[PDB]
């Protein structure tokens with residue numbers, strides 16, 4: 001299980017739900033992890049549909065401030081610590097930011113966001129993940 005593949009494939013899925021293409025992701029084109037994450041993120045987005053509708057209009061993305069927007073949101077999200085729900089929330093947020101970046105003619109940001117997600121995965125969330133039994137724990141809990 002490779003965190004960059006998990007990130008790439010999740011963003012590819014979010015972009016495809018809006019009919020948007022992505023070059024960095026055709027390249028990479030463990031499957032149970034991606035399915036479970038797809039399903040979990042979709043459910044999270046139905047549960048929080050009205051809040052996501054508001055967050056999409058209030059991201060205020062620009063090429064020079066999107067990094068700080070990402071960091072602000074993600075640090076607030078993990079303020080109480082880490083759990084599976086908040087990791088899915090993190091993926092869904094990154095998905096919404098990539099969608100809005102293409103939607104607002106800032107397509108290049110998608111490659112930056114995949115970086116920051118990957119980075120944040122490996123630096124600040126990977127320990128908790130191993131220590132709670134890895135991604136097969138997640139597939140154990142919410143899989144098909």
Ligand SMILES: CC(C)c1ccccc1[C@@H]1CCCN1C1CC2(CCN(c3ccc(C(=O)NS(=O)(=O)c4ccc(NC[C@H]5CC[C@](C)(O)CC5)c([N+](=O)[O-])c4)c(Oc4cnc5[nH]ccc5c4)c3)CC2)C1
Nearest residue numbers: 039040043044048051052055083084085086088089093142
């Ligand atoms: C737009 C906004 C909402 C937002 C989004 C992203 C970032 C920030 C924000 C905003 C910015 C300002 C405030 N901020 C919000 C405050 C905030 C509210 C949300 N909150 C959190 C934090 C943890 C949980 C939480 O319950 N954890 S859990 O017990 O580990 C857990 C429980 C259930 C699942 N899956 C169930 C599974 C799905 C697939 C099925 C259907 O096939 C089978 C069943 C998972 N799981 O990982 O899949 C983990 C949560 O509730 C759910 C309820 N059901 C969910 N289903 C998928 C994820 C998920 C999370 C909300 C975190 C804090 C975020």
